[PDB]
């Protein structure tokens, strides 16, 4: 069962483990740290997400990419894509939805504003 089971400022729980930093959820259920440097190098801040951040996910050929824009959704997207951007606590619900339905879903979650 690859589900998020908790969302709150500064923290989300995925597959029984709490993450207090931004994370990338891969199609297979794996979790890796969000690569904030990609965006910091391109924009001078990681508050604007570079499309390059999605590049590692595009390889897994997901049917849907969900982006948790954070708690209070301050984080902004610097591109147009099929990816679904939603406030984090709304993003995890949507992820659980699709994952529950069996969809190849991947996500990038921002735990703060």
Least CB distance to Cl ion at residue 101 (A): 27
Closest to Cl ion by CB, 5 vs 21, is 21
57 close to 24: Cβ distance less than 8 angstroms: yes
Q: How far apart are CA 70 and CA 8, in angstroms?
A: 10
47 burial via Cβ count (<10 Å: 0-12, 13-18, 19+) = middle
Least CB distance to Cl ion at residue 108 (A): 11
> Which residue in 5, 11, 21, 84 binds Cl ion (CB under 5 A)?
21
Contacts to Cl ion from residues 33-52, by CB under 5 A: 33, 46
Which residues bind to Cl ion, rule: CB under 5 A?
A: 21, 33, 46
């Amino acid at each position: 069962s690859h589900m998020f089971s908790d969302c709150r400022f500064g923290s989300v729980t995925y597959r029984g483990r709490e993450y207090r930093s931004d994370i990338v959820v891969h199609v297979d259920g794996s979790v890796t740290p969000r690569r904030k440097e990609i965006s910091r190098r391109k924009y001078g801040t990681s508050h604007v997400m570079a499309e390059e951040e999605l590049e590692e996910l595009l390889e897994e050929k997901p049917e849907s990419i969900i982006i948790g824009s954070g708690v209070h959704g301050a984080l902004e997207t610097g591109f147009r894509s099929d990816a679904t951007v939603l406030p984090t606590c709304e993003a995890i619900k949507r992820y659980n939805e699709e994952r529950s339905a069996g969809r190849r879903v991947a996500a990038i979650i921002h735990v703060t504003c």
